[PDB]
Amino acid sequence: EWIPETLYNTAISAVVDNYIRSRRDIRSLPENIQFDVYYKLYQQGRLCQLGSEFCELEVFAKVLRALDKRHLLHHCFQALMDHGVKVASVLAYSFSRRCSYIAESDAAVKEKAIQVGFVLGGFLSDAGWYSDAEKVFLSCLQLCTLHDEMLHWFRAVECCVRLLHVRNGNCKYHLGEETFKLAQTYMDKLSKHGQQANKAALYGELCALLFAKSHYDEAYKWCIEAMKEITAGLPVKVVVDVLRQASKACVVKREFKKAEQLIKHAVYLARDHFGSKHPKYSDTLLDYGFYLLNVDNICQSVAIYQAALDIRQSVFGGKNIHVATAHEDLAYSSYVHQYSSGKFDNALFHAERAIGIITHILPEDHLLLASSKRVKALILEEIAIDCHNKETEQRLLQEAHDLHLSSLQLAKKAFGEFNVQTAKHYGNLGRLYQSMRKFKEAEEMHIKAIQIKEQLLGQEDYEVALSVGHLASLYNYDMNQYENAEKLYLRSIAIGKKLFGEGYSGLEYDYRGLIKLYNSIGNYEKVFEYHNVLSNWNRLRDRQYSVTDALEDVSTSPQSTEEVVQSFLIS
Amino acid sequence: EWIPETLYNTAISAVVDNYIRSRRDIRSLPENIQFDVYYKLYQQGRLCQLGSEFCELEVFAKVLRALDKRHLLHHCFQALMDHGVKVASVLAYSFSRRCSYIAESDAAVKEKAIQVGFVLGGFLSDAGWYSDAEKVFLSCLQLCTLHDEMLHWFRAVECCVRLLHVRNGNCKYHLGEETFKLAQTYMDKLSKHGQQANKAALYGELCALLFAKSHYDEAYKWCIEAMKEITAGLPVKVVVDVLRQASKACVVKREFKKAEQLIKHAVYLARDHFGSKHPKYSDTLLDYGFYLLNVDNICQSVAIYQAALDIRQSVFGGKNIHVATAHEDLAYSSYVHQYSSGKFDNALFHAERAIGIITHILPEDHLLLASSKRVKALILEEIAIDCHNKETEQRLLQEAHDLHLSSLQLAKKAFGEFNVQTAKHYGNLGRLYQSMRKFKEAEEMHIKAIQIKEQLLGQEDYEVALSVGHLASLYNYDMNQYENAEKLYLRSIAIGKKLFGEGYSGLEYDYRGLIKLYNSIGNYEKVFEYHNVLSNWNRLRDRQYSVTDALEDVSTSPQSTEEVVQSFLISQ
Amino acid sequence: DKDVFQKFYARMLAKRLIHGLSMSMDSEEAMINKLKQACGYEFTSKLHRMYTDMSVSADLNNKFNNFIKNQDTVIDLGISFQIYVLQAGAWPLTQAPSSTFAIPQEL
Amino acid sequence: QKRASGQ
Amino acid sequence: QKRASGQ
Amino acid sequence: MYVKLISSDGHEFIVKREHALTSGTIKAMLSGPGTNEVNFREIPSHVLSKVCMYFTYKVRYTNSSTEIPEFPIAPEIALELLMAANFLDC
Amino acid sequence: KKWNAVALWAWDIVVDNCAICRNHIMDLCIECQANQASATSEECTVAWGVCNHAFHFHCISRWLKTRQVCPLDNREWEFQKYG
Amino acid sequence: DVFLMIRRHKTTIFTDAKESSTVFELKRIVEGILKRPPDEQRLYKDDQLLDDGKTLGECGFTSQTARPQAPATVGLAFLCIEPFSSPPELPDVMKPQ
Ligand SMILES: [Zn+2]
Ligand SMILES: [Zn+2]
Ligand SMILES: [Zn+2]
Ligand SMILES: [Zn+2]
């Protein structure tokens, strides 16, 4: 149609083409214009002319007030970080140095810089630079501690709710508890002095910290406490933040009726306000796909991580931890979904991507690098079985052995010996030893895996049953201890149908194993007794398979706020 | 235990933090301060703020004169070139623009622009950016040659001896010979006016030009003029350059005893004067390992390339051409060292690094990519035969087929069909065809190289004996022509003891090439004869093989430069 | 908080074992073995390595005394002495050895 | 495939 | 192996 | 035991001698002809005060067990103080 | 005339970490810590190298099963001083 | 420990003192170099005289606000405390021009 360009979009391209002469005068332009000049520099690809200005804190304070075009700033910021220049670490250090100089000032200048820190530290934390956002908040925190009145106590607890969030994406859990304890010190002081603070966002972080350390018993306790303080006056960003973390603790609690209403309300609440492109919406989808994968709704769990990844791949550039986290979970979901098929080439690409990103931006001994490392190892051991080349079978299976042990060490260093995540690596390493023909070694890993999970989770739980089936296949298919395997298969059968029914698609490896269990010990009557149940499993799975996609399952306005909270709280 | 930061190093962090309000006022700081401010921009990661302050010649020249911390400057400069910014090209264009703007000015003012060109040209050539250091020197030679007087001819030859170095190092050999012809003009003007300059740097650099072009006979005869020009007043930089290039010519003309005393004195001279991690000392070690690779001390040579790569990887960063050639020499030395062991995992990585770097900083049609493409395929061929997969065997050698084809095409463009460097590509390609099921043309590739190598060197050189042993091994295992294969092992065995001795490492690959040549020919008594001498070869290898660190072998040479240069000329 | 109990017990087992003060060698083994099955298998690792070091100390001192008797030349130590060998990564006795010492000629 | 989906 | 060191 | 540290504008900044020995130039100024006054006609007083504030900051915090706080160097003073740090070799 | 003393023996390496498994050099390797901390404990030797980078023997054996270079310095690996 | 500077007209006393010390002993430190009688010398922080009876901690010179990098100030008189100098006013850049 050949429509001419607006005079604005023409004057933008004429001051950018004359940027060297006009760099001094551009910084004096209004915020809406100034960001559009800088975004034009990114569009032209002149990142050096741009990162020379974002490294200054004052300019990055001006381009942080453009809230409409923040989604363009994240892609412009992430492009700088991959370009070279450490624009995140320079901004965080340049703020801490400037923040440390106004300690001997009044409460007007200090509140000006604290608000800069809350939008800068609120941006680096949003872009994934948790190790660099914490340095901003730790400087904002020490501004609130200087003045000990009722006014600044509400900001010190506003830093500690954010410090507790940048210390979980950075997997610094052992500092998280000390942060929460310091928050209560600034909460009890404020609450006692005739001013009650909303303790809803802060307890939501503990619903993810204690979830991360596999304290699901403690996670659900703070899940209830978080939602008891949900008020309609809270920001939607805070409210959707509590819901997604509350869902993750409820799903791992293996109760799914209360879990769906929390996260489907969260996805709706993060889609009507934030829209289908804001990273927070994709953040909710990532936790929504956690619900789908644990309820055996694996078919549409891949489609919700792919949606979650595609949002983050557009807002958060190439090499970002948030993109890498989506690559990790999508690789795991594609691993689970296509486990039966045995084809892992898209899943391997996603798992390899999540390591090519995290190893670039995180140290070699980071906990989040360990969880993303186990997913490649799970994929590698299946390729090391499906491939028919013995040389490839041995070497690829050995590579997956170094990844689990490296992943186990990082989990064992921070989560301790007695945790589900540490035991989750024992079970994965147990399955690997089964494929490595080390059936003697595979016995003691699963025994240590079940004993840790049984002691912590309980005698009957979904995670315990899924670990037993790993041991049951060991005692049945390649160790010939059918008497020992007889109770193990039955143990997982009861738990498997306890929370999913007979149509649980994971029972295929449980029912078929029972058929091979009875094939070598006689009693062929029970072979047909389990043979029709496998057909019953076939009938009860494909009939319920036909269901609409979860993206439209939430639809438009399914329920209302302050109603899902009350419905969940009373139950 | 947590020492307080220095006031200077704390004011540096304060000034850098106010870069926006002081970037035009930092340039008024002292010379030693200015580098340390611009260093903190690299340390903090502000590459983009630094890149706009090293692309400017008016401020980069003030940084360059801080020669105390030049080892840090090479790290910052290299950290910018792979960052994305073209600091080398922009500094080349900025200086050429200044030269044209100042050519019409007074010759006294023109001398100052020459001195900046020597500092900037001497830096960009030290960093392995000869393709952009050429324009700095070209705009310096052109500037100095406008007025022809006795003062300008001193700088004109200096602008040309450096131009020879930056053209020879960039594989502009054809332009190098023409460049030396310009040098012959200015020395005559200086000589005819009652003045004499030292031509040791110029003559020695010409030797590297002829050595690269595989004119070993013409290169070695040029060492003598280079060596005799060495005096006491020459800088250690020049003396190491003459000795290092004379050693490479000496070791290629099979004069290892004379080559030893030279390069073992070059390493000591570089270490005694140029620290221990200077790029020049890394340059000496990269050609000291060249000497030890050609005198059958491979087990010690790779331990010196690792001592020359680890120097070039701490001064220069990645994506440099100096760390690229240090990779390509170790990737080949480890390939020779692990030929028997089959442990080419290290030698493949050091060859992919050299390939992944030169393909990034050099164009596709460059000769420096040829010398690194051949090596990567050499490791790539023995990985396939070690593997037990038909699918991997075909594709790996097919990749090795293209790499030799690319190397041969790239080498023939500049050298020609009758040079040893192009001849060596046929010999490596012929050995590849020995496992490519192309035996009919495999002998053709060998014999094409054989008659070239004999033509250029002779019948009594070690270079041809390597392919002669390879060509006759083709007959023994694939051509089944045992008649004309036994006549070539004897030629290879006789020259092995004549040159190296009984402990030559390649003597296993034709002694065991005779334990099977005579096995299927009928003779059985002579089979026991060469079975005995192979054990004799093993029995003398046990005592001959002494793994001593050659870095500490050259610790303190009791001879100075005067004794070595006279001892070399006395023998020759 | 069982982790702080292990540190407190190790800081007291180490002082108890090296001084020769013990009810019996098997009694400390039984206490160590009970924690291995009660709390955790890897919980009592440094604590278990604190044991089995004095157990092999008697074995080693027999070898050490036999070493000097089998010496070619006649070397007499004079002052009789025995040594308990302790792993650096197990015993909590490392502390901060920042002070040097020069033992005289008597030993 | 006999060990079900890896945890 | 069968062949000598490459060159 | 006290060193008379005058400024360009005739402003004196006397401090303990062991504190003034941190900078190698002042140690050289005390040596030779003339624990007395030293000419400082180039360095101004507003930046020499920060140098003297650094002197007690350097000596007191040597081998400190706790983490040393950042020495504050104001943006308006940073460039002038840096040359003073190099000239004094502090 | 009678004496008795302790000896805090440790391996000669000062890096203090096994670079493959990240465990402390004196403690059992991550492979020993995985299955049994006592049955396999006694053979958790450390192996040095020509580059003088002592690692856990089980860890360095796992490393040599897949790759053929020292992890820290990318040189070739040749044992010298099995501890 | 409390670090302070003492300024009468332009003399400056960068001498530390204990937070529990009294003004009396600090006055003896001033006479060590100024060689003047201590009774004549009087000190005036924020243009307010300090009693010799009260200790350093009772005058607001807390050790937590008397760091060596930024020591607290106190006047002196036998006030004419002239300022040191005016640092060059650096531009704010983002201000319009
Ligand atoms: Zn840049
Ligand atoms: Zn280890
Ligand atoms: Zn071990
Ligand atoms: Zn190493």
PDB file of N, CA and C in Angstrom, chain A residues 23 27 47-48 51-52 56 58 83-86 90 93-94 97-98 389 391, chain B residues 10 13-14 17 20-21 23 44-49 52 83 85 388-389 391:
ATOM      1  N   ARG A  23      24.657  13.047  20.588  1.00  0.00           N
ATOM      2  CA  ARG A  23      24.578  12.182  21.762  1.00  0.00           C
ATOM      3  C   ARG A  23      24.422  12.996  23.035  1.00  0.00           C
ATOM      4  N   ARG A  27      20.236  13.008  25.497  1.00  0.00           N
ATOM      5  CA  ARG A  27      19.979  12.653  26.886  1.00  0.00           C
ATOM      6  C   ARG A  27      19.065  13.652  27.582  1.00  0.00           C
ATOM      7  N   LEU A  47      24.793  -1.492  18.592  1.00  0.00           N
ATOM      8  CA  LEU A  47      24.737  -1.770  20.021  1.00  0.00           C
ATOM      9  C   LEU A  47      25.855  -1.072  20.780  1.00  0.00           C
ATOM     10  N   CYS A  48      27.007  -0.863  20.143  1.00  0.00           N
ATOM     11  CA  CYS A  48      28.097  -0.164  20.814  1.00  0.00           C
ATOM     12  C   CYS A  48      27.726   1.283  21.104  1.00  0.00           C
ATOM     13  N   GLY A  51      25.009   0.529  24.168  1.00  0.00           N
ATOM     14  CA  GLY A  51      25.551   0.082  25.437  1.00  0.00           C
ATOM     15  C   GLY A  51      26.484   1.077  26.083  1.00  0.00           C
ATOM     16  N   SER A  52      26.999   2.029  25.311  1.00  0.00           N
ATOM     17  CA  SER A  52      27.744   3.140  25.881  1.00  0.00           C
ATOM     18  C   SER A  52      26.858   4.081  26.680  1.00  0.00           C
ATOM     19  N   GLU A  56      25.571   3.829  31.819  1.00  0.00           N
ATOM     20  CA  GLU A  56      25.313   4.911  32.754  1.00  0.00           C
ATOM     21  C   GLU A  56      23.998   4.652  33.474  1.00  0.00           C
ATOM     22  N   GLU A  58      22.069   6.874  35.118  1.00  0.00           N
ATOM     23  CA  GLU A  58      21.067   7.926  34.966  1.00  0.00           C
ATOM     24  C   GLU A  58      20.251   7.752  33.690  1.00  0.00           C
ATOM     25  N   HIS A  83      25.888  -9.225  23.689  1.00  0.00           N
ATOM     26  CA  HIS A  83      26.786  -8.513  22.792  1.00  0.00           C
ATOM     27  C   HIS A  83      28.199  -8.421  23.342  1.00  0.00           C
ATOM     28  N   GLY A  84      28.423  -8.808  24.591  1.00  0.00           N
ATOM     29  CA  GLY A  84      29.628  -8.355  25.243  1.00  0.00           C
ATOM     30  C   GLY A  84      29.322  -7.673  26.553  1.00  0.00           C
ATOM     31  N   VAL A  85      29.369  -6.341  26.533  1.00  0.00           N
ATOM     32  CA  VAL A  85      29.381  -5.456  27.693  1.00  0.00           C
ATOM     33  C   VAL A  85      28.453  -5.925  28.803  1.00  0.00           C
ATOM     34  N   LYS A  86      28.983  -5.975  30.025  1.00  0.00           N
ATOM     35  CA  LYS A  86      28.227  -6.416  31.191  1.00  0.00           C
ATOM     36  C   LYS A  86      27.415  -5.232  31.692  1.00  0.00           C
ATOM     37  N   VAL A  90      27.440  -3.707  35.553  1.00  0.00           N
ATOM     38  CA  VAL A  90      27.883  -2.321  35.651  1.00  0.00           C
ATOM     39  C   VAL A  90      26.802  -1.459  36.284  1.00  0.00           C
ATOM     40  N   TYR A  93      26.571  -2.321  40.078  1.00  0.00           N
ATOM     41  CA  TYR A  93      27.675  -1.743  40.833  1.00  0.00           C
ATOM     42  C   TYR A  93      27.614  -0.223  40.832  1.00  0.00           C
ATOM     43  N   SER A  94      27.251   0.383  39.699  1.00  0.00           N
ATOM     44  CA  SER A  94      27.174   1.837  39.645  1.00  0.00           C
ATOM     45  C   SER A  94      26.053   2.369  40.518  1.00  0.00           C
ATOM     46  N   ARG A  97      27.473   1.964  44.311  1.00  0.00           N
ATOM     47  CA  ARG A  97      28.428   3.021  44.618  1.00  0.00           C
ATOM     48  C   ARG A  97      27.726   4.359  44.812  1.00  0.00           C
ATOM     49  N   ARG A  98      26.757   4.680  43.952  1.00  0.00           N
ATOM     50  CA  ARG A  98      26.021   5.930  44.106  1.00  0.00           C
ATOM     51  C   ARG A  98      25.081   5.887  45.302  1.00  0.00           C
ATOM     52  N   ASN A 389      24.372 -48.840  17.865  1.00  0.00           N
ATOM     53  CA  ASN A 389      25.825 -48.873  17.781  1.00  0.00           C
ATOM     54  C   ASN A 389      26.404 -49.061  19.177  1.00  0.00           C
ATOM     55  N   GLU A 391      29.463 -48.976  20.285  1.00  0.00           N
ATOM     56  CA  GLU A 391      30.406 -47.926  20.655  1.00  0.00           C
ATOM     57  C   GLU A 391      29.676 -46.664  21.097  1.00  0.00           C
TER      58      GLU A 391
ATOM     59  N   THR B  10      41.119   3.502  44.083  1.00  0.00           N
ATOM     60  CA  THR B  10      39.767   3.879  44.471  1.00  0.00           C
ATOM     61  C   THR B  10      39.285   5.106  43.708  1.00  0.00           C
ATOM     62  N   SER B  13      38.055   3.858  40.315  1.00  0.00           N
ATOM     63  CA  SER B  13      36.668   3.411  40.315  1.00  0.00           C
ATOM     64  C   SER B  13      35.701   4.581  40.374  1.00  0.00           C
ATOM     65  N   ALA B  14      36.095   5.686  41.007  1.00  0.00           N
ATOM     66  CA  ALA B  14      35.207   6.841  41.079  1.00  0.00           C
ATOM     67  C   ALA B  14      35.166   7.600  39.760  1.00  0.00           C
ATOM     68  N   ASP B  17      33.225   5.501  37.209  1.00  0.00           N
ATOM     69  CA  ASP B  17      31.793   5.555  37.475  1.00  0.00           C
ATOM     70  C   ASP B  17      31.165   6.838  36.944  1.00  0.00           C
ATOM     71  N   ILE B  20      30.492   9.365  31.938  1.00  0.00           N
ATOM     72  CA  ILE B  20      29.710  10.234  31.065  1.00  0.00           C
ATOM     73  C   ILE B  20      30.110  11.692  31.243  1.00  0.00           C
ATOM     74  N   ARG B  21      30.417  12.095  32.470  1.00  0.00           N
ATOM     75  CA  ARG B  21      30.744  13.477  32.770  1.00  0.00           C
ATOM     76  C   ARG B  21      32.236  13.757  32.711  1.00  0.00           C
ATOM     77  N   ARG B  23      34.423  11.732  30.210  1.00  0.00           N
ATOM     78  CA  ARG B  23      35.057  11.040  29.095  1.00  0.00           C
ATOM     79  C   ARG B  23      35.849  11.981  28.199  1.00  0.00           C
ATOM     80  N   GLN B  44      35.766  -3.770  34.330  1.00  0.00           N
ATOM     81  CA  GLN B  44      34.360  -3.709  34.697  1.00  0.00           C
ATOM     82  C   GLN B  44      33.452  -4.306  33.639  1.00  0.00           C
ATOM     83  N   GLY B  45      33.987  -4.666  32.480  1.00  0.00           N
ATOM     84  CA  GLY B  45      33.180  -5.195  31.409  1.00  0.00           C
ATOM     85  C   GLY B  45      32.624  -4.158  30.467  1.00  0.00           C
ATOM     86  N   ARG B  46      32.910  -2.879  30.690  1.00  0.00           N
ATOM     87  CA  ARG B  46      32.409  -1.836  29.809  1.00  0.00           C
ATOM     88  C   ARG B  46      33.168  -1.837  28.494  1.00  0.00           C
ATOM     89  N   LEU B  47      33.016  -2.893  27.701  1.00  0.00           N
ATOM     90  CA  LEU B  47      33.727  -2.952  26.432  1.00  0.00           C
ATOM     91  C   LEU B  47      33.219  -1.887  25.472  1.00  0.00           C
ATOM     92  N   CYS B  48      31.916  -1.609  25.504  1.00  0.00           N
ATOM     93  CA  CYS B  48      31.336  -0.668  24.555  1.00  0.00           C
ATOM     94  C   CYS B  48      31.772   0.763  24.846  1.00  0.00           C
ATOM     95  N   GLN B  49      31.946   1.114  26.119  1.00  0.00           N
ATOM     96  CA  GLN B  49      32.497   2.427  26.432  1.00  0.00           C
ATOM     97  C   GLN B  49      33.977   2.503  26.096  1.00  0.00           C
ATOM     98  N   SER B  52      34.707   2.762  21.958  1.00  0.00           N
ATOM     99  CA  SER B  52      34.630   4.106  21.405  1.00  0.00           C
ATOM    100  C   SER B  52      35.790   4.987  21.839  1.00  0.00           C
ATOM    101  N   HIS B  83      35.054  -8.776  20.462  1.00  0.00           N
ATOM    102  CA  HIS B  83      33.818  -8.221  21.002  1.00  0.00           C
ATOM    103  C   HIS B  83      32.870  -7.791  19.894  1.00  0.00           C
ATOM    104  N   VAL B  85      33.682  -4.812  17.791  1.00  0.00           N
ATOM    105  CA  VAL B  85      34.179  -3.534  17.300  1.00  0.00           C
ATOM    106  C   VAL B  85      35.472  -3.764  16.528  1.00  0.00           C
ATOM    107  N   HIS B 388      35.022 -47.929  14.794  1.00  0.00           N
ATOM    108  CA  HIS B 388      34.552 -49.179  14.209  1.00  0.00           C
ATOM    109  C   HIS B 388      33.168 -49.014  13.588  1.00  0.00           C
ATOM    110  N   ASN B 389      32.942 -47.887  12.917  1.00  0.00           N
ATOM    111  CA  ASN B 389      31.660 -47.594  12.294  1.00  0.00           C
ATOM    112  C   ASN B 389      31.877 -47.274  10.824  1.00  0.00           C
ATOM    113  N   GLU B 391      29.612 -45.817   8.849  1.00  0.00           N
ATOM    114  CA  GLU B 391      29.039 -44.507   8.555  1.00  0.00           C
ATOM    115  C   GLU B 391      29.991 -43.382   8.944  1.00  0.00           C
TER     116      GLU B 391
END
